[PDB]
Amino acid sequence: MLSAFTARPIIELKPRDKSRIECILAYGDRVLVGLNTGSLRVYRVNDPTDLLREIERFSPRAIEQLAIIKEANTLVSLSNYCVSLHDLHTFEPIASPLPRTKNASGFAVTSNIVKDPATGIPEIISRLAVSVKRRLLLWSWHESELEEEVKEVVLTESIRSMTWACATRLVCGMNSGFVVVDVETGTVEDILGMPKPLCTKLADGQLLLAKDVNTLFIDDTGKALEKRQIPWQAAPDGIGYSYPYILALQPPAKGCLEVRNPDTLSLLQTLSLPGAAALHFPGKGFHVLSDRVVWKMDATDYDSQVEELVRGGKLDEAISVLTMLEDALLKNKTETLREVKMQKA
């Protein structure tokens, strides 16, 4: 229906290579690949990739998850079922393991600009939240300085997914359902309207929740929205958002990626990515990783997308896409939109 993104492979392991990819991290020019052997490769993205540095025995076991906080110049790694903080550039350990992170399931990182209530000065605040059984551990950086106190919230069930709704609220997903946690006040709220609980952040403080084939739309406060359920045939393995589209990753056996409209819920695009098992997000594209290939998703310019929709006769979809987009991303959103509306009538 639409060529929203173009898929090109930037990293390829060979079929009989003993190493497999477990997670990646892309920041600027660089892509950091964590392997099942504990090694950590660093790639430079050219304009496909050049292997700059391999750190074997970075962690004595597989690297499950990677993140960074740029203010503190810190690399967060989930390995040996614990969490470790390394220097982003020398990769020497700052704190490995991080205290109380033993048997951690995962973590979620955010960093936002917040104003001091007393002085009203913009300050960069960083949040790292780790899931350890039914416990939620919260570290924070104030001006890249890690605070000496760790906040802990105890839940009623084990945490299976963690997605930051905003700078102060975190959506946590368990088996029974989803909850909203206020990291500042430690207050938990129930969300009202083996399958993994999926959650991704949309635009304008909106979030999409998915369990099996059921879906729900909420806001940054965690209140339900009057929206239809997304009509996809099978439950997605993962979900994500790349402005302005919703992305759904089907199980690795199918090896497909769905690009859907958050407004009309129609299937804009389907991409065949064999073995694709995870999505990686930060108007620039995202990444999709298999156990051997890392593809970079390049978004087509939105003017050509709307022209393609108009040429196909999908007028209502072009109107919805145009309404969603910011005006600076189009040559002339106003006149293009009025034109498409006059083509409809």
Residue numbers in the entry: 1 to 47, 96 to 241, 271 to 359, 369 to 431
Authors' description from the paper:
Lysosomal fusion is fundamental to cell survival and requires HOPS, a conserved heterohexameric tethering complex. The heterohexameric HOPS complex mediates fusion of late endosomes, autophagosomes, and AP-3 vesicles with mammalian lysosomes or vacuoles in yeast, and is probably the best-studied tethering complex. Five out of six HOPS subunits (Vps11, Vps16, Vps18, Vps39, and Vps41) are predicted to share a similar architecture, comprising an N-terminal β-propeller and a C-terminal α-solenoid domain. At the opposite sites, Vps41 and Vps39 bind to membrane-anchored small GTPases (the Rab7-like Ypt7 in yeast), while Vps16 and the SM protein Vps33 establish the SNARE-binding module.
The intrinsic low affinity between HOPS and Ypt7 prevented reconstitution of the complex for structural studies, therefore, we instead relied on AlphaFold predictions. Additionally, we solved the structure of the β-propeller of Chaetomium thermophilum Vps39 by X-ray crystallography, which largely confirmed the predicted model. Cristal structure of C. thermophilum Vps39 (1–500) construct (cyan) is shown and superimposed on the model of Saccharomyces cerevisiae Vps39 (dark green) generated by AlphaFold. Surprisingly, in the AlphaFold model, Ypt7 binding occurs at the α-solenoid of Vps39 where it does not directly interact with the β-propeller, as originally expected. Furthermore, the binding site on Vps39 is placed approximately 5–6 nm above the membrane if Ypt7-anchored HOPS is in an upright position on supported lipid bilayers.
